[PDB]
Design an enzyme around this catalytic site. Sequence first.
Site, mmCIF file in Angstrom:
data_model
loop_
_atom_site.group_PDB
_atom_site.id
_atom_site.type_symbol
_atom_site.label_atom_id
_atom_site.label_comp_id
_atom_site.label_asym_id
_atom_site.label_seq_id
_atom_site.Cartn_x
_atom_site.Cartn_y
_atom_site.Cartn_z
ATOM 1 C CG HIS A 1 35.782 102.354 61.625
ATOM 2 N ND1 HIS A 1 36.884 102.953 61.079
ATOM 3 C CD2 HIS A 1 36.179 101.119 61.995
ATOM 4 C CE1 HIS A 1 37.903 102.121 61.073
ATOM 5 N NE2 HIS A 1 37.503 100.993 61.632
ATOM 6 C CG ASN B 1 41.576 104.984 64.861
ATOM 7 O OD1 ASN B 1 42.141 103.949 64.543
ATOM 8 N ND2 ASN B 1 40.918 105.125 66.015
ATOM 9 C CG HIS C 1 39.856 105.053 57.223
ATOM 10 N ND1 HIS C 1 40.485 105.606 58.322
ATOM 11 C CD2 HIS C 1 38.669 104.575 57.650
ATOM 12 C CE1 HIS C 1 39.688 105.479 59.367
ATOM 13 N NE2 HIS C 1 38.591 104.843 58.987
ATOM 14 C CG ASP D 1 33.633 107.528 61.789
ATOM 15 O OD1 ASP D 1 33.822 106.296 61.824
ATOM 16 O OD2 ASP D 1 34.396 108.328 61.171
ATOM 17 C CG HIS E 1 34.540 103.094 56.951
ATOM 18 N ND1 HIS E 1 34.548 104.427 56.599
ATOM 19 C CD2 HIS E 1 35.139 103.023 58.168
ATOM 20 C CE1 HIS E 1 35.072 105.135 57.588
ATOM 21 N NE2 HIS E 1 35.453 104.304 58.543
HETATM 22 C C1 LIG Z 1 34.967 105.818 65.046
HETATM 23 C C2 LIG Z 1 36.409 105.492 64.596
HETATM 24 O O1 LIG Z 1 36.672 104.199 65.073
HETATM 25 C C3 LIG Z 1 37.923 103.735 64.609
HETATM 26 C C4 LIG Z 1 38.277 102.469 65.391
HETATM 27 C C5 LIG Z 1 39.118 101.536 64.821
HETATM 28 C C6 LIG Z 1 39.467 100.390 65.512
HETATM 29 C C7 LIG Z 1 38.974 100.191 66.786
HETATM 30 C C8 LIG Z 1 39.341 98.930 67.535
HETATM 31 N N1 LIG Z 1 38.290 97.990 67.271
HETATM 32 C C9 LIG Z 1 38.118 101.118 67.355
HETATM 33 C C10 LIG Z 1 37.772 102.264 66.654
HETATM 34 C C11 LIG Z 1 37.333 106.609 65.151
HETATM 35 C C12 LIG Z 1 37.428 106.867 66.512
HETATM 36 C C13 LIG Z 1 38.230 107.916 67.006
HETATM 37 C C14 LIG Z 1 38.973 108.735 66.147
HETATM 38 C C15 LIG Z 1 38.901 108.479 64.773
HETATM 39 C C16 LIG Z 1 39.506 109.070 63.640
HETATM 40 C C17 LIG Z 1 40.447 110.277 63.545
HETATM 41 C C18 LIG Z 1 40.189 111.201 62.547
HETATM 42 C C19 LIG Z 1 40.980 112.324 62.395
HETATM 43 C C20 LIG Z 1 42.040 112.552 63.254
HETATM 44 C C21 LIG Z 1 42.930 113.807 63.084
HETATM 45 S S1 LIG Z 1 44.357 113.503 61.971
HETATM 46 C C22 LIG Z 1 45.210 115.087 61.943
HETATM 47 O O2 LIG Z 1 45.169 112.364 62.426
HETATM 48 O O3 LIG Z 1 43.924 113.181 60.586
HETATM 49 C C23 LIG Z 1 42.259 111.620 64.263
HETATM 50 CL CL1 LIG Z 1 43.541 111.748 65.430
HETATM 51 C C24 LIG Z 1 41.468 110.494 64.423
HETATM 52 C C25 LIG Z 1 39.018 108.382 62.538
HETATM 53 C C26 LIG Z 1 39.408 108.512 61.106
HETATM 54 O O4 LIG Z 1 40.637 108.681 60.868
HETATM 55 O O5 LIG Z 1 38.571 108.236 60.219
HETATM 56 N N2 LIG Z 1 38.176 107.428 62.934
HETATM 57 C C27 LIG Z 1 38.080 107.440 64.286
HETATM 58 ZN ZN LIG Z 2 36.859 104.730 60.018
HETATM 59 ZN ZN LIG Z 3 36.506 108.236 60.268
#
Ligand SMILES: C[C@H](OCc1ccc(CN)cc1)c1cccc2c(-c3ccc(CS(C)(=O)=O)c(Cl)c3)c(C(=O)O)[nH]c12
Ligand SMILES: [Zn+2]
Ligand SMILES: [Zn+2]
Length: 232
Positions: free
Chosen positions: A87, A181, A150, A89, A85
């Site tokens: 994002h 997220n 997601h 990561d 996707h």
């Molecule tokens: C790189 C990505 O960008 C997303 C984004 C979107 C929108 C904007 C606005 N334009 C900016 C950035 C990103 C950044 C930071 C954290 C995450 C997480 C994350 C994964 C597991 C946990 C633990 S849990 C117990 O809740 O499952 C948690 Cl807290 C978080 C995920 C993911 O869920 O895939 N993706 C993340």
């Molecule tokens: Zn993502």
């Molecule tokens: Zn992710």
Amino acid sequence: SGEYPTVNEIPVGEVRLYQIADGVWSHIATQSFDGAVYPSNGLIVRDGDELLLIDTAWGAKNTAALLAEIEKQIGLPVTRAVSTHFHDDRVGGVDVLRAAGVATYASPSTRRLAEAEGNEIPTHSLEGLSSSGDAVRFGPVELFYPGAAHSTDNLVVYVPSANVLYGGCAVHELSSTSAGNVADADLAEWPTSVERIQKHYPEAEVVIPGHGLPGGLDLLQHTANVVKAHKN
Ligand SMILES: C[C@H](OCc1ccc(CN)cc1)c1cccc2c(-c3ccc(CS(C)(=O)=O)c(Cl)c3)c(C(=O)O)[nH]c12
Ligand SMILES: [Zn+2]
Ligand SMILES: [Zn+2]
């Protein structure tokens, strides 16, 4: 020393590999985002005497470190990469890959979203994945579009030789207490998309989430549960 490596065990900038099955590894890296540190996973699948990479290591320097770790541990060239996707990561590091001779791929939906957001953009478009339930072959894997979860563009990856299901960020680890997220998610459709994965890959033996520890098929039901409760 053989356990699946966790967030506080990996300094930001370092990458570790984990053998999942014959010819299948995950890659694990850590990154800072909005003042917190997170682990994330990707996949490596042996493709004859080449490697197929699934997802970057979440950043340019992490992705360079990933290529170095692959050379150290495996010693076969990465020739193609798929981002599951849009994002960071998943695509952050695509420019590093593209300068190291790797051909980068993603669905047209992912490429559009990455472009609109200002994220790095894979070079090649993967057609045949625009309707939920669609599947296409890509080297030693099958790519599957389960529907919005997601993100609207999220893909999952199956390795038929090993019955390995890489769920990416549409699938959460068993210890998850939250849906991660969700900024770009469709919480209402997510369970339906997970049900499609369950129906399509009933013989999966290992399920790998986008973040956290692999397990078995229970990760799918757990994900549906956490998403429904998050929405609740
Ligand atoms: C790189 C990505 O960008 C997303 C984004 C979107 C929108 C904007 C606005 N334009 C900016 C950035 C990103 C950044 C930071 C954290 C995450 C997480 C994350 C994964 C597991 C946990 C633990 S849990 C117990 O809740 O499952 C948690 Cl807290 C978080 C995920 C993911 O869920 O895939 N993706 C993340
Ligand atoms: Zn993502
Ligand atoms: Zn992710």
